[PDB]
């Protein structure tokens, strides 16, 4: 069914992937790298005290606060979803090997019984109606760029100035580029404007993963994580093998002389890709407006901020079902990519822009180092984008693509299993648009609050309600997959976008509340993904600019968790036995310190002023900028804080740009 070409770094096709500069050349040869993460200025994640602290706290919390999750996966009581062993990993040390990314997922979908394309005309109308509601009345906006950020594949530059340049030149030439593509001149478009090429794979860590304490042996066991080797990846699973990567860790001892206490492991690594900025810029100029519209006009189902921005919605429902989807990104269907491009064309949209968009979701992938001595290889031929890897993490609109699939998948799941009486409202595009529009505004008996693969499906009073309870029981039996498009089930310990839905004895949304997941605070504070980077001066270009500020917002964020205080105590205690020190004291100092420094950045903060006029979200963000990529967005944060992390291209230039792509 097609092996997918593969080229080594020495091949010319791989070489054209990196400009003739130092960073690019080094990015193409970066070999496997491993090392203890600097959890806080001065403390290494593998510091024997810290590990010790981790052992005591992970066992104490597990033992004093076992999880309260009923069989329908609702959490109640203490608000704990599972044990606390997740923190038992030697952070900056990965499982081995990381997976190779699958070149084609068509077979993965088939063997999992997911469909080829819409299974019925209704579904086809819906997916399509979504594209119309989402791409119709866009308003230009400044193109925003993250300060840390790399241009990726062609130049691997991080200088804002150069980024602004590339972006602007990209909005000017985006059109000759897409036309060259429309005639199949991918190489030209890439050589002349750096649009095309490949995504650059980088393996990111998942600091915490899931460890189990076997009672039969009293020894811990990690959740096996399957990964594909080269053969497996280039043949879509037809050949090669799929296996469990080793999270062992014991090797850290012979290799680095590092002490690995019992029951600690290498953290899992998930593939992540950076696309070529020249191609993403044309795409982000469309995606930011689209986000804007769906967070405004359809704010009901798509825009979420505070734990209470959520309860307001879930509280009205008579039955809330919290879903979970398996492997969202690698199962995401190319046929949806094609359906979407098709609709956009039908609605107007410059065909050169659509060509650009389709191509960004089919680009080759270049892998750096999934493991020691392994592959610096290009999967896919840039001359003819062919990959069907299913949704790249660095494509300009990953969140949009995922939200659009799914949002509709849940709808279909609701219409299919509970509201057949709604089917007659979807007869043609107009009625579909009219229905979907009504549905996302929360005006129907079936509702939804969702973001990519995280959702909360809802039912008010009505005919749909009795079905719904069936859907739910269907999910609890886990025997039949409820959708034709993605493998869906219920989340064991339902939560939406960080927050857990805490149910009382009643077991009904109406009397349930949304609290913060205490487990998260733990992950955040004792297993960050990245170290604090004292190495970099400009704290804005640091993965974790002001780790200290989190303390100023903990309360607001995790306060309602039933065990909040008990946890802070366990920490103070366990921390004391490992450092003869006071965490808190430790944290307050860090708070003062970053608070003070923060002021050198917010050019509007009276030098030694305080955190006075800042959002709890502002704090969490300045302490951890990812989140601006998966929880919140530009408008959720104050503007004074925004400039500290972002910079942009003139609204003027995007507007000129949008005019030429927009239908009207
Ligand atoms: Mg969830």
UniProtKB/Swiss-Prot annotation:
Residue intervals of the RdRp catalytic domain: 309-484
One Pfam family recorded for the sequence: RdRP_1
Cofactor(s) needed by this chain: Mg(2+); Mn(2+)
Transmembrane segments: none
Coiled-coil blocks: none
Keyword tags: Magnesium, Manganese, Metal-binding, Nucleotide-binding, Nucleotidyltransferase, RNA-directed RNA polymerase, Transferase, Viral RNA replication, Virion
Catalytic activity field: RNA(n) + a ribonucleoside 5'-triphosphate = RNA(n+1) + diphosphate
Any GO BP annotation: DNA-templated transcription
InterPro entries: Cystovir_RNA-dir_pol, Cystovir_RNA-dir_pol_N, DNA/RNA_pol_sf, RNA-dir_pol_C, RNA-dir_Rpol_cat_phage
Annotated positions binding Mg(2+): 453, 490, 494
GO cellular component terms given for this protein: virion component
GO molecular function terms listed in the Swiss-Prot or TrEMBL record: metal ion binding; nucleotide binding; RNA binding; RNA uridylyltransferase activity; RNA-directed RNA polymerase activity
EC id: 2.7.7.48
Subcellular location as annotated: Virion
Root EC class: transferase
UniProt superkingdom: Viruses
Function noted in UniProt: Rna-dependent RNA polymerase part of the packaging complex that packages the viral RNA segments, replicate them into a double-stranded form and transcribe them.
Subunit structure: Part of the packaging complex composed of RDRP, P4 and P7. Interacts with P7.
Protein name, UniProt field: RNA-directed RNA polymerase
Gene: P2
